[PDB]
Amino acid sequence: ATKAVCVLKGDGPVQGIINFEQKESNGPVKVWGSIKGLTEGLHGFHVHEFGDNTAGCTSAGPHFNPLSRKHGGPKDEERHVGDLGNVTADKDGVADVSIEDSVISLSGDHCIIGRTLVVHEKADDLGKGGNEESTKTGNAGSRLACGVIGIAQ
Amino acid sequence: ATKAVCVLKGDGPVQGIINFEQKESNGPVKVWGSIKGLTEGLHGFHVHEFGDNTAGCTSAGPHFNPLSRKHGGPKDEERHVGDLGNVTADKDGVADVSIEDSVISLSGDHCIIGRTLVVHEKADDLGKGGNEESTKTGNAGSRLACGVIGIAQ
Ligand SMILES: [Cu+2]
Ligand SMILES: [Cu+2]
Ligand SMILES: [Zn+2]
Ligand SMILES: [Zn+2]
């Protein structure tokens, strides 16, 4: 696959659409779109392991972490594959997302297709928060919206 | 992987959960679960090509058809890889889904992870109807509910 897409929804007002593009096998992945209904500020943004929304976003499990690393930010060597950092909303509640990432993929063992993208209640501290949870979740709190990442046209 | 899941959502509520299991990559896929909120009778049931719900189930495109075949039933050689036939709802509006299929897969070129499962308004005629559409869509009509197929734990 070269293109993927995710519709983010949850139980509250947070909703969005996120697109992915990967031009080349083993090249970087462009990630772009918009999320609305958010509180102003940073909100953690990750790919979680399972594309399972059976009981809502909780069913998606932990961060996608095929290489058994600690949590980090997207520009860290020490990160989960799924660690895409934060999106940032304005007072208007909108986060415009524009990310390139070279660790996620749309094929192979780092593939994110069929997994869940999640936007969080709180900021992700990118593993620099100095408690144990920082190293696992980034202290980003509950899951406000999510969706399964699908193959796109 | 060897398990996948799909949450179907549409107006009614037409709602359902479908589980997938494939014991080995060269093996059949067990498909099972429940869909509620349906009218009594047969409803077409297929994997569509794109895991895109941007604008609702319409965004998923046509039946998943990597081999460029005509529409058929699941037992037919001439079928789309996505052709899973019909589910049947009782007077209570529930369809008990219990399928094994050897053409879909959870890995490889026929993988359905990241694609959309759809349940339709009307019966699928399994390509045996009296017109040209039968060999494309089975005449199953609109899309009552769908979801993106994700990797499960
Ligand atoms: Cu997350
Ligand atoms: Cu269909
Ligand atoms: Zn992480
Ligand atoms: Zn078909």
Side-chain angles (χ1 to χ4, degrees):
Chain A
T2 64
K3 296 178 181 153
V5 69
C6 186
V7 178
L8 299 170
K9 293 294 195 150
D11 290 335
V14 178
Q15 59 171 267
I17 319 287
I18 303 296
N19 310 104
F20 301 80
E21 184 167 24
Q22 188 181 30
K23 285 196 285 198
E24 302 183 338
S25 171
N26 301 295
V29 183
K30 292 215 194 155
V31 181
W32 75 98
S34 183
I35 311 170
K36 65 182 169 174
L38 291 162
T39 59
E40 172 189 34
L42 269 66
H43 295 269
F45 186 65
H46 324 108
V47 182
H48 288 238
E49 190 177 5
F50 308 120
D52 188 341
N53 189 236
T54 291
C57 303
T58 177
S59 301
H63 296 180
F64 180 46
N65 184 26
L67 296 171
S68 305
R69 301 300 214 76
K70 297 312 170 229
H71 182 75
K75 308 302 146 159
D76 298 333
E77 180 166 43
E78 191 80 27
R79 61 171 269 192
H80 303 143
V81 172
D83 286 349
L84 298 179
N86 294 281
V87 299
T88 296
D90 266 12
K91 278 291 215 201
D92 63 358
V94 180
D96 289 318
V97 181
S98 183
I99 290 170
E100 283 192 358
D101 191 77
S102 254
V103 174
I104 63 172
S105 188
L106 304 183
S107 70
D109 158 87
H110 291 228
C111 187
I112 65 171
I113 292 167
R115 306 191 186 272
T116 297
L117 186 65
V118 179
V119 64
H120 288 267
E121 177 201 358
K122 320 182 176 179
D124 182 344
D125 65 27
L126 310 190
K128 299 280 193 161
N131 68 5
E132 193 81 3
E133 189 100 36
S134 182
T135 270
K136 297 187 49 163
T137 67
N139 290 296
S142 75
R143 304 175 188 195
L144 305 186
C146 62
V148 187
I149 302 166
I151 303 164
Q153 183 178 317
Chain B
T2 124
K3 303 190 185 313
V5 64
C6 188
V7 180
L8 299 165
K9 289 204 162 75
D11 239 78
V14 174
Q15 308 193 291
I17 301 291
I18 303 296
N19 306 291
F20 304 78
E21 178 165 28
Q22 186 181 32
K23 282 225 153 290
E24 55 219 320
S25 50
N26 49 353
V29 183
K30 290 197 203 194
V31 183
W32 78 98
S34 172
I35 310 165
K36 68 186 175 184
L38 292 167
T39 59
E40 170 186 33
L42 275 63
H43 294 273
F45 187 65
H46 325 108
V47 182
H48 288 238
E49 188 178 3
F50 310 119
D52 189 343
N53 292 4
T54 294
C57 301
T58 189
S59 298
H63 297 179
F64 181 46
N65 187 23
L67 290 165
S68 304
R69 294 198 171 159
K70 290 179 181 206
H71 180 76
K75 307 184 106 293
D76 302 325
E77 183 173 33
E78 189 68 27
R79 56 173 275 190
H80 302 147
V81 164
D83 290 341
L84 300 173
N86 291 287
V87 303
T88 299
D90 189 83
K91 278 283 199 192
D92 60 9
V94 176
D96 288 320
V97 179
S98 174
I99 281 166
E100 193 144 344
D101 196 67
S102 283
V103 174
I104 62 167
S105 194
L106 306 187
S107 66
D109 204 37
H110 300 170
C111 185
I112 64 172
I113 293 168
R115 305 191 187 273
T116 292
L117 189 62
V118 177
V119 63
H120 288 267
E121 180 201 352
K122 308 206 258 281
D124 182 343
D125 67 26
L126 311 189
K128 298 303 198 267
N131 68 10
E132 84 80 29
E133 192 71 330
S134 179
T135 70
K136 296 180 168 57
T137 65
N139 293 108
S142 78
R143 300 177 188 197
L144 301 176
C146 62
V148 185
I149 302 163
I151 304 165
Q153 175 176 329

